[PDB]
Design a protein around this ligand. Structure first.
Ligand SMILES: Brc1cc(Br)c2[nH]nnc2c1
Ligand SMILES: [Cl-]
Ligand SMILES: [Cl-]
Ligand SMILES: [Cl-]
Ligand SMILES: [Cl-]
Ligand SMILES: [Cl-]
Ligand code: NA
Length: 333
């Protein structure tokens, strides 16, 4: 018999209750602008699917970011555009400003409102306890918003969080792997960077949901409070699950595989072994102790579960005692 089906605990049917056109990105008609409205200033970064530049909008002299979409399925381009259009104006969501093609090369590019090219990975190993809580709360605002809008990011990692530390502002970027959540849909498991992949991806459980992003967020939190980059340091996708099993233990892993009737790749049969669930105290030392609290560990424990249904939702996470002082300072301001 096949895998047992799964549904999101929250925002399950939000796309069903929308007009078809909200989520039917294959049918979306893009009005392509002229990239000659912009002048590229300098190259900022190189990605698998994109080259990214600082640019000037000639018309108003406003600074922008241009992402030139490296050759890829047209379906994937419409998906990213539609998701960015749907999420435009959401809290801590990057703002799509324009969609253009190079008149010569015909290559499509996305134009975003300017953010500094200071990604979270550059800062997140140097934060105070309070700033970790503050910026985690800001990421959760973006995730609860996109989940509530029927979208899962599927590539949450430090390199996809842009931060202006001076102005205490954060944006979640690179929506190129994001998808619409539809109950009963089986998704591609070849998403996310190795160190942030949830167990559902690693065991090839395809009927996953928004909760994938909450695993990735837990991997970021563990890295930051323990000053361990990455927290789960696998050699490859098989060893990645071994790294997780040595921390979360094998008892809960095999119970998860039994619950969803998952057919575990034979490769796993000799490498997972038998491991106790480790107390988080084992990762605490003199250099990270100032970032670790009972509140931080209680919260982390409730993100890093094998069973995606067990993990906190983004809104449940925002309710956790770890954020009480952030929530109080926000109301004060
Ligand atoms: Br602004 C901005 C910056 C980068 Br780097 C992005 N990668 N994908 N979308 C982006 C938007
Ligand atoms: Cl601190
Ligand atoms: Cl990263
Ligand atoms: Cl998919
Ligand atoms: Cl590890
Ligand atoms: Cl222990
Ligand atoms: Na402590």
């Amino acid at each position: 018999s096949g895998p047992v089906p799964s549904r999101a605990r929250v925002y399950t049917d939000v796309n069903t209750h929308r007009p078809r056109e909200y989520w039917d990105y294959e049918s979306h008609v893009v009005e392509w602008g002229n990239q000659d409205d912009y002048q590229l200033v300098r190259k900022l970064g190189r990605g698998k699917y994109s080259e990214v530049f600082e640019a000037i909008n000639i018309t108003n002299n406003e600074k922008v970011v241009v992402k030139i979409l490296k050759p890829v399925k047209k379906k994937k381009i419409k998906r990213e555009i539609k998701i960015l259009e749907n999420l435009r104006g959401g809290p801590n969501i990057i703002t799509l400003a324009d969609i253009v093609k190079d008149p010569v090369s015909r290559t499509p590019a996305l134009v975003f409102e300017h953010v500094n090219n200071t990604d979270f990975k550059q800062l997140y190993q140097t934060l105070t306890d309070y700033d970790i809580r503050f910026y985690m709360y800001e990421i959760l605002k973006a995730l609860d918003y996109c989940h509530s809008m029927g979208i899962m990011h599927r590539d949450v990692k430090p390199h996809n969080v842009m931060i202006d530390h001076e102005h205490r502002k954060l944006r979640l970027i690179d929506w190129g792997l994001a998808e619409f959540y539809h109950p009963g849909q089986e998704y591609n498991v070849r998403v996310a960077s190795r160190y942030f992949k949830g167990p559902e991806l690693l065991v090839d459980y395809q009927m996953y949901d928004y909760s994938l992003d909450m695993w990735s967020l837990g991997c970021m939190l563990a890295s930051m409070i323990f000053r361990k980059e990455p927290f789960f340091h696998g050699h490859d996708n098989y060893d990645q699950l071994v790294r997780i099993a040595k921390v979360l233990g094998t008892e809960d892993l095999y119970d998860y595989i039994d619950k969803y009737n998952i057919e575990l790749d034979p490769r796993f049969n000799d490498i997972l072994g038998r491991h106790s669930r480790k107390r988080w105290e084992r990762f605490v030392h003199s250099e990270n102790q100032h970032l670790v609290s009972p509140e931080a560990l209680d919260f982390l424990d409730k993100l890093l579960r094998y069973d995606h249904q067990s993990r906190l939702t983004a809104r449940e996470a925002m309710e956790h005692p770890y954020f009480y002082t952030v929530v109080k300072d926000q109301a004060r301001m």
